[PDB]
Symmetry: C3
Subunit: 364 residues, 3 copies
């Protein structure tokens, strides 16, 4: 296997785009939402835990998530990336690029949690939680879905992280809230940067600048647009008028919904997933810190289920694997969702409780 | 024809850059200019009509603009992109990428109009106008210039949309104004994002990461810089001192001027076009909602004419087509400008009037 | 030599990223720091001198920096890029792209100076200084380090501009200060854009999307993260609590430290350089306009020295050149630092004094 320089180029730019989602994307999104007196502290916590995730990732995170191990975790053979030669190829790109790309996905997941809870949580407590939860939740779930583990081996479809990123972080946020907008142009700016960066996430999940990356790119455009319109219509119906936060939340709803699906569906399915995600998102926030689950959880679940529908050739998808019915695939999607929810929840509980027993959760 | 993965990579990143121009680029630019009480509504309208354009584009927009039809429009064979196979190649890239790239150009055009007029126009009215004008103005003009239609067949030179994007949207904005800055750091931020995104527009118009993309890239840098300096000097001459809005408007003036020309001229012509566009822009705003025509119209016309001059090998350009004199080419540029102006104006009038007859134009 | 389209694509996107660092990156960073009454003027000066650098670069800057001449400067053979054919290849990319990439590095260097001093300096004076200093400092130093001149021929290691960009601009800023935060979310936004853009600077310095670009990318992620954590820990130790400006300054400290090193070291060295740069940065600002030298100077020196250590195969680096000991290489790094400091200082003194003798330095 020789690295393709076009794929190298594409994947490095895609990684920069995903990093852009956290720094400053998610930080600006939460920054406009939370109380003004908490903005600077939140921005600090997002920046510092971003740094921490990057370092934990290189030290042992990548090895435990993407090394060959068992159904649940990898190994400790790639500590500080030892035993990975610089010219080592993974797929069609240098493995180093796969390290950086996968690391940037861990970063956005943690940014979603920290941004939402920074208001309510002590600094030292969030650092402890991050270490526990990144190590015992994100890493095993990344391994199970993308590292050849339990879920991948049963044929779970999750292109860019409906489970690993969105459901995963939404449950940690929900456990957080349970245990513990002044600048709308800022929220919009955050949303926009999130949208643009997300193309690196969705298309880059192909691992190559091929027709699947192209598909995921177009689907991302279609599903985000459909979700904005879906949310806004429901908002006009329920509330009498659209709002900027509505439009922005709609965009995020479509982006989340299409994340597990983008590389498997036709543009028709993307339009349908978008509309359903936008509406489900609006229902979610109507019926949870900064509506993390309300959108990332609900729309993550919706998207992961609908992938099991719209991957069908019949519906314009790339097709299920050989010998797989829609019936069987839907069940596998449901099982993957359930596993992610319980795994994240249990680990998150452990994380917050360890923090609470050590330094105390609630901010003095 | 097989897709080149380097071109795939380049074109997908260029499309993300052009989307970045609208979301949040143009929105932030207008956001700093308009009255504070109108900012949130404008940002909502730009986001929602952005979503609408994306969807109309996939449903039928691309097919009617880039399908084979007549001199004026394509066909309805690529509805929801039906009959385009995933692995279908257009030029040296997957056709799906050409869909996304061309869609992002439609989006920035509509963003230029909506951002400027959102203050004055009712929400439902702008949605109706967008549908009419995207369908009957942007699509036929994109087809005439870039889809093998009337203007392309007579040899019109317009690399990245001096007519299709800038003159087109400037006339719609001017008809709009006729019928119907509190945050300068925000305007600057919008301008900057517009500048960076524009490289995807200008260089990506090559359809490939070749020496023409490289040329258009350098020309974009040169012409923007020359236009900033030209505007600022004229401002110092006329007003006694430069201003931030002046500098920013200068940048936009150069970017617009070089849009039709970037892929056809030498760096010497780029410098000359930049200076002339910057000065013409300043004259334009001195002698129109948020100066849409003042800069996009004037500098679009200036750039489209000057392309007919500086494409000459004599002047460092790539050369006119075989059998074409500068005399003949200039006439073709003038005719393309005239056609765009009258086509956009007539359709825009129809659009606003339909909106006015249906829901009423003026915001209650 | 034929151009590789993947490298063309990668290098054009990397150039856009580096331009993004100045416009709006550095402008927003200084914008949040300086007094509110000075923000608009500063943003204007950064924009106008950015335009000026771009134009001076094309007219003669690139030719004098990268043309073949002597140990100190190139030639005047590539005036307005004359004698460079469009299809001319430099390395594995079109030479035009090398022009744009190298130009964008000159731009960020000047942006670092102008942003810091715009408060204190008259508009006409900064324009004169820029012309003198770009011409007599940046150009010869770029030639000496990257254009086959004095320092490159003695084997100086400087991958992405620890000397050419950071030490160079830090000394000009320090001479400036000697002769002559209201928006922290803005500073953070500036910092973030600086971080994302810097990947184009560091990885693009490979000139190709290969394993060295991949290395420099990962090292950039590691060193920035380590520097944030290093600064924050020292801040918690010295001041009792982290701060947003601390976190942001830490990020910049790591980015600067790793700039000369990124393409030569292992991830272990990147982690060590990051921590040491973050701490040295904090010492620097504790023990100078907008702490330009405090971070860019101190961390530039630290990074340039440490490159001479961690390039060793023994320490996970790519290895010293044949026949070079760590002892000999460290000396060459020290000599390169010393030369840059004295060269920049002397030229900067000349520049400011010429400005002072012509229009007067201090702003009326």
């Amino acid at each position: 296997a020789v690295a393709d320089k076009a794929d190298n180029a594409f994947m490095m730019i895609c990684t920069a785009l995903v990093l852009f989602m956290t720094i400053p994307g998610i930080a600006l999104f939460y920054g406009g939402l939370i109380r003004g007196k908490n903005v600077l502290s939140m921005l600090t916590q997002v920046t510092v835990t971003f740094a921490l995730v990057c370092i934990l990732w290189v030290v042992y995170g990548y090895s435990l998530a993407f090394g060959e191990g068992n159904n649940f975790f990898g190994n400790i053979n790639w500590l500080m990336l030892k035993n990975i030669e610089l010219t080592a190829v993974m797929g069609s790109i240098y493995q180093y690029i796969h390290v950086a790309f996968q690391g940037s996905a861990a970063c956005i997941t943690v940014g979603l949690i920290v941004g939402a809870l920074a208001e309510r949580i002590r600094f030292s407590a969030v650092l402890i939680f991050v270490v526990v939860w990144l190590t015992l939740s994100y890493i095993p779930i990344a391994h199970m879905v993308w590292g050849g583990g339990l879920l991948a081996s049963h044929g779970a479809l999750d292109f860019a992280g409906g489970t690993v990123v969105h459901i995963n972080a939404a449950i940690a946020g929900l456990v957080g809230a349970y245990l513990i907008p002044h600048n709308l142009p800022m929220v919009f700016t955050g949303t926009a940067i999130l949208y643009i960066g997300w193309f690196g996430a969705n298309a880059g999940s192909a691992g190559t600048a091929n027709e699947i990356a192209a598909l995921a790119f177009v689907n991302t455009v279609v599903a985000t647009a459909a979700a904005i319109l879906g949310w806004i219509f429901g908002e006009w119906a329920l509330r009498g008028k659209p709002s900027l936060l509505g439009a922005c939340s709609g965009a995020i709803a479509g982006l989340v919904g299409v994340t597990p699906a983008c590389g498997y569906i036709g543009v028709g399915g993307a339009l349908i997933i978008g509309v359903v995600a936008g509406l489900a998102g609006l229902w979610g926030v109507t019926m949870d810190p900064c509506d993390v689950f309300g959108v990332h959880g609900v729309c993550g679940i919706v998207g992961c289920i609908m992938t099991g529908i719209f991957a069908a050739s019949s519906l314009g998808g790339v097709g299920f694997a050989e010998g797989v019915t829609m019936g069987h695939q839907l069940l596998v999607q449901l099982e993957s969702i359930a596993i992610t929810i319980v795994w994240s929840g249990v680990v998150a509980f452990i994380g917050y409780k360890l923090a609470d027993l050590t330094v105390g959760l609630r901010v003095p």
